Amino acid sequence: DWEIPDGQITVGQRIGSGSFGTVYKGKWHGDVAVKMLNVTAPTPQQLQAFKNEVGVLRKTRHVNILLFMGYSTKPQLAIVTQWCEGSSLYKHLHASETKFEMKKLIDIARQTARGMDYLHAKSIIHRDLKSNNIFLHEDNTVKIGDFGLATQFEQLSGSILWMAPEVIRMNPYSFQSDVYAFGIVLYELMTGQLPYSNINNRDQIIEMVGRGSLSPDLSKVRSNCPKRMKRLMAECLKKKRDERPSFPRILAEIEELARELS
Amino acid sequence: DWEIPDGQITVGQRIGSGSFGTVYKGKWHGDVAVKMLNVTAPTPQQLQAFKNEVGVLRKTRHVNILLFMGYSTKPQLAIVTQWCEGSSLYKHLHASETKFEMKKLIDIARQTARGMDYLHAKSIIHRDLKSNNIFLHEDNTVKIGDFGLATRWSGSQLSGSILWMAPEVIRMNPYSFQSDVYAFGIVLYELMTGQLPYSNINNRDQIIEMVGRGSLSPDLSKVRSNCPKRMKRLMAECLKKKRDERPSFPRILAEIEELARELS
Amino acid sequence: DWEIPDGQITVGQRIGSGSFGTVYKGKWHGDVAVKMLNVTAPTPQQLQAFKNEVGVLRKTRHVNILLFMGYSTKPQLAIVTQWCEGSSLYKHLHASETKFEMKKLIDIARQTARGMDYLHAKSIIHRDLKSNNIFLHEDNTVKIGDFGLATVKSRWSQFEQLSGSILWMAPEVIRMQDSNPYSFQSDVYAFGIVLYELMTGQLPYSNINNRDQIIEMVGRGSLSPDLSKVRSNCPKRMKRLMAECLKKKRDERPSFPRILAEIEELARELS
Amino acid sequence: DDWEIPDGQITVGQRIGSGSFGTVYKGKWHGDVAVKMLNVTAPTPQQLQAFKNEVGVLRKTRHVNILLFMGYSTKPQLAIVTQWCEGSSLYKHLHASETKFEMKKLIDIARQTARGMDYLHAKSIIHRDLKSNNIFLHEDNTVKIGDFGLATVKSRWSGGSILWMAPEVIRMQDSNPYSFQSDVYAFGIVLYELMTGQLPYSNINNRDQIIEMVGRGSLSPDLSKVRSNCPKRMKRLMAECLKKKRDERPSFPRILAEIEELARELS
């Protein structure tokens, strides 16, 4: 049983708010993170969403998935996980002067494929893989999770740059849409930028990716990116979702080309 | 401006039994209803949801739309509307031995068509029209609103309202004017049969699967014998599985107003 | 009248849970089971399903149908039945080392035929017959019921919400086109699949991991249970009856009066 | 080369327009400016990229007929600062105002627009949304090309540029729908606006029907509606820019030279 009685967790610094609750740093046999609701009486809908999310996290035991640790129901619904140290992959790639050697970029790709392969073997669809939901714990261990937090206008836009054509169209989410999103993560790692950086108008992106043949410009991958990795990325990015590989092949392929580098 | 200064609204008894309810009877220049986010500090998303709803409500002025009256921010986020007297249409039809005359049932359908026609003219989608969201104020005026309302206003799970969801909504632009027309069609079915559809299918998952695949639709032979022919035709029109075969509310309103005149 | 006043039932151990309801073991003049809605203000479909379920159970009196005993209104809607001792046929056959002798396998088929024959004579379509809804009470009496508790879909997860019923759905129900395909005949097909579990000891399509392949191929008619898997001592009358119940064209399946007479006659023949 | 404006220097004034994520204000910074400010909580990776890419394109432009980029800010919020344009857009003048334009003025409006589009293309910049709403008539004598749109996301509870969109942009079936040639087409619709005073397909408004028929080539602008005193070389130029086959469209060096040469002939 993973319920944590009231009075044990010392809630500390507020990190941000998402669509569920508010994430804090806390103390419980060390450092933890607490995502908790604002209400003392949750609706049946909030309680269902809470049981769903505890339900999926309780099914995961893998070094590359954010470690679930427990939950509270009083005074508020709360999900307790390990505390991740460092920054998301997004901040490293796109919002800092962190320079990664290609060996480390491959290693990050390999660890992300391990976590995704694990989730899919459990028939878990992440639905929003992107470099912002990849945390580089201790600068050495990928942790896949849901790390999106708002620390005037409301954010209305989805993760359009990682959405497969069939998703950006609109059961669109599937294992194959997670694979496509992983392909865009490979693009981030291997080019150092986001796709479609010359197209400011998001409607044009939506229109061209979902209807036409707009796809990331693979000529921007760094010269030292292994050919096998470039080829794998293109497979993950196929428009027809049934031509994309599955994560057992993706993992096997990344582990094998990485060993070629050593 | 519609902001109400602190300490003007007196809050009273919460409406409902569940301790998660948000609606209270209150006093502000008379009776009011107050929908309150009871938290010590709202999140940004809660702040935005509160502003999204007030933003839609303040664009409505119509006798058949719940009257928005103001909002407050301290001590909590609170939306203030008129206080409605009486019961929802769901309670009259399904939770009480209220029996309506056909004339009264047509009048309820007509007034609900006026409010829906007004909303669509303002390009507002209700997204959850059902007999629970139709209030019979003073037993003479339909008010359309949110009267369960623990759910919806995030700019951006099938846990309820499935009986009013169009095939294309269950499938998954799912919400549209045309899905509002479908839900209105089910409301007509409630008015004209006295009952909810699919009364013999306990399993909610089989309803969901069958309705979305076009293999299940309301049994229209259950409409009562004095329901006007034109009203039955209109109902089948509003319930078409292909959303584009459904009439728009201007037509719906005109046909109800005219078939009603043929019976007073 | 079958309403049970409040405070008479001592609700005990939680036994199972879904998003809307909870099953408990209880005390009410002996042991009972209690299915109780989670909320005090249910949705319009939950309230409608409660009334229809009480109204259907109220009309059943048969040793192979779960015994309805009463229902509650306060604090929450609850339906009260007998407490069944033991495990479902599914747990016995597929999640346990129970080995049934063929005579006992025939007997379970016989008792299930009796209860379905009775339901259909009351104009009751079960709609979800499968080995999980056949309770082996006291290890000697079949109790047909419907023990599922509905769950809302999670974000992280086709026919997904029905995934526990797919192996027992007739082709027309899998196709699910145009009109309601649930009927006395689709119940019969689900009985055919139960016969397959009993007589093979396994679920159909064990060789096929792809759930989407199963659905497509069953619905089209290019896939049906492998009847070569029946056990050596399965009587010829039973394997022939199974195949009748599994016919693809629903109008070609027999009805339960003939099903029950066939099983009862063939059971007599083995002493 | 730093165009970053320290915080506290700009005085943000009247709000001019809003979209779902951003807002344009009139401001004060060594005189009058316009300030486009990202006002969204938790800006997405794509919104942050578009802010950066727009500053990088604008910083490569110095031309009297291109909206003048002046600076950008990072604190407290991301903002792009430009000159303040005085007057109204070409769209407001033609379609929502009692403005009468001499045909001389209309040729000169098309001539300056061609100058700035020729400049943009020479710098390898595809505008991607040229329309009369994006042509500002600064002080009623100087065309300023810009992009004054602010992205909007339709709300869940509620149920554009298409008139200037080239057929291949509507179809999304050919490689690279947005190109120099799709900008030439849009310019052709701006020429049609100028020489007829009305928007195209004005008497055909069936909506998604118009879109479908323009994509498949079964509906094109009615060129018979050009004003009588419209030069023949301007009407044949407009018809060339409007060609369905993108490769038959002329480039702006030729477009500008044709307008240039024809505007001398009528003083």
Ligand SMILES: Cc1cc(F)c(NC(=O)NCCC(C)(C)C)cc1Nc1ccc2ncn(C)c(=O)c2c1F
């Ligand atoms: C608290 C919390 C509870 C949760 F339940 C989820 N949920 C979730 O991961 N779901 C996806 C699950 C699966 C991948 C299996 C689909 C996320 C989080 N967030 C979280 C956790 C640790 C953190 N440490 C440091 N910092 C700076 C953070 O911001 C931080 C953080 F935001």
Ligand SMILES: Cc1cc(F)c(NC(=O)NCCC(C)(C)C)cc1Nc1ccc2ncn(C)c(=O)c2c1F
């Ligand atoms: C308080 C309140 C505040 C709100 F903001 C909304 N919102 C809303 O209607 N939105 C839909 C908008 C649109 C139709 C335009 C789509 C609803 C309510 N509810 C309410 C109002 C009055 C009531 N009077 C009596 N009684 C017994 C009630 O229970 C009651 C009640 F529950």
Ligand SMILES: Cc1cc(F)c(NC(=O)NCCC(C)(C)C)cc1Nc1ccc2ncn(C)c(=O)c2c1F
């Ligand atoms: C409480 C309850 C009330 C109900 F109304 C239904 N309904 C139902 O069978 N409907 C089908 C009717 C018809 C066949 C005619 C179609 C089911 C149940 N469940 C139940 C009953 C007894 C149990 N004894 C032991 N154990 C371990 C259990 O788990 C258990 C259990 F889960």
Ligand SMILES: Cc1cc(F)c(NC(=O)NCCC(C)(C)C)cc1Nc1ccc2ncn(C)c(=O)c2c1F
């Ligand atoms: C502030 C701002 C900043 C920008 F960065 C862009 N961007 C942009 O033009 N990009 C296209 C670039 C290229 C042509 C090279 C492709 C636009 C604007 N808007 C703006 C500027 C000035 C204004 N003066 C008066 N009035 C009434 C206005 O409304 C007004 C206005 F809205």
Ligand SMILES: [Cl-]
């Ligand atoms: Cl994005």
Ligand SMILES: [Cl-]
């Ligand atoms: Cl419902």
